[PDB]
Amino acid sequence: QYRPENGSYATNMTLANSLFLMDLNERKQSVWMRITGGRSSGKLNDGQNKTTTNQFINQLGGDIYKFHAEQLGDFTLGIMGGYANAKGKTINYTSNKAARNTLDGYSVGVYGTWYQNGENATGLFAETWMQYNWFNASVKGDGLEEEKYNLNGLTASAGGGYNLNVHTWTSPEITGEFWLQPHLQAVWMGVTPDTHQEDNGTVVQGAGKNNIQTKAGIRASWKVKSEFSPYIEANWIHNTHEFGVKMSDDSQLLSGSRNQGEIKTGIEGVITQNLSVNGGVAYQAGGHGSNAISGALGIKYSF
Secondary structure, rough: OOOOHHHHHHHHHHHHHHOOOOOOOOOOOOOOEEEEEEEEEEEEEOOOEEEEEEEEEEEEEEEEEEOOOEEEEEEEEEEEEEEEEEEEEEOOOOOEEEEEEEEEEEEEEEEEEEEEOOOOOOOEEEEEEEEEEEEEEEEOOOOEEEEEEEEEEEEEEEEEEEEEEEEEEOOOOOEEEEEEEEEEEEEEEEEEEEEEEEEOOEEEEEEEOEEEEEEEEEEEEEEOOEEOOOEEEEEEEOOOOOOOOEEEEOEEEEOOOOOOEEEEEEEEEEOOOOEEEHHHHHHHOOOOOOOEEEEEEEEEOOO
C-alpha cells in the first residue's frame, strides 16, 4: 500500500508548473485580464491513488512597447502577473485511506509577440514569455497533522505558427473570413519543490524537475462581421518528463501523461471599439484517469 500523500505531493508539483501557463493566440487583439476555472483528475503508479482537484486562476498584464519595424515586422513587449489557487484530494482505492492538498501561488514576468505581415493577415508569427512562480503548498493526510512547504521557480515558453486566410465570403443575409493556423509551442517547466521532512521523519523530494511540454496543432478560426470570431483547435501534447515524487528510501511514484490530446473551442466578440470579451473551453486527456476541463473568461481593452 502506498500512502495517498504521495498523490498530494506529486499533484502540487504538477499544478505548480502548469498553473500559470499561457497558450498561443491568447495574447492578441493593450491591457488584459484572464480568469480561469478548472478541474483535473490524475493517478499514480500505485494502481491505487487517484487525485482530483479544482482550481481558480487570475492573470493580468499589459503592453509596454510596440515597435513596428520596416525591415522585419511588428513587435510587442509587455508584462504579466497572476495569482492562483487550488485544492485537491487523493483517495486510495484499495486502502481507502485519504489525503488532501492545497496550493496558493503568484507569478510575474514578461512576454513577447511577433508578426511578420501583421495580425489580420496571412504570415508567420511567434510568441514568447518567461516568468517566476512562488507557491505555498500544504499536504494533509486525514487524521494527521498538516505539512507545509514551498515550490518556486522559472517557467519559460517559446512558440510559433502560420496564419493563413483560406476563404472570404459575404452573405446576402454577412462578411465571413475563414482561417487556418498550424502551430508549434514548447514550454520549460522549472518550478521545483522544497525538500520536505514530515512529522514522521519521511523526507519528500520532487520528481520531474525541468519537464519540457511540447504542443503541436492546428487552429481553425471563422471570423464574422455584419464582430464575433469562434474557433476550434486540436493539439498534441508531449511531455519530456512525468511529474512525481521521490522518497528517502529513494523509491519513486509518478503520474504519467507523457502524451495527451487536447481540444479547445470558444467564441470571441467585439463589444466596444476598445473593449472585447471572450470565453474558451479546453479539455485534455491522457491515460485512463487523466483530464483537465477548463473554462476561461478574458477581457482586453485597446487604447
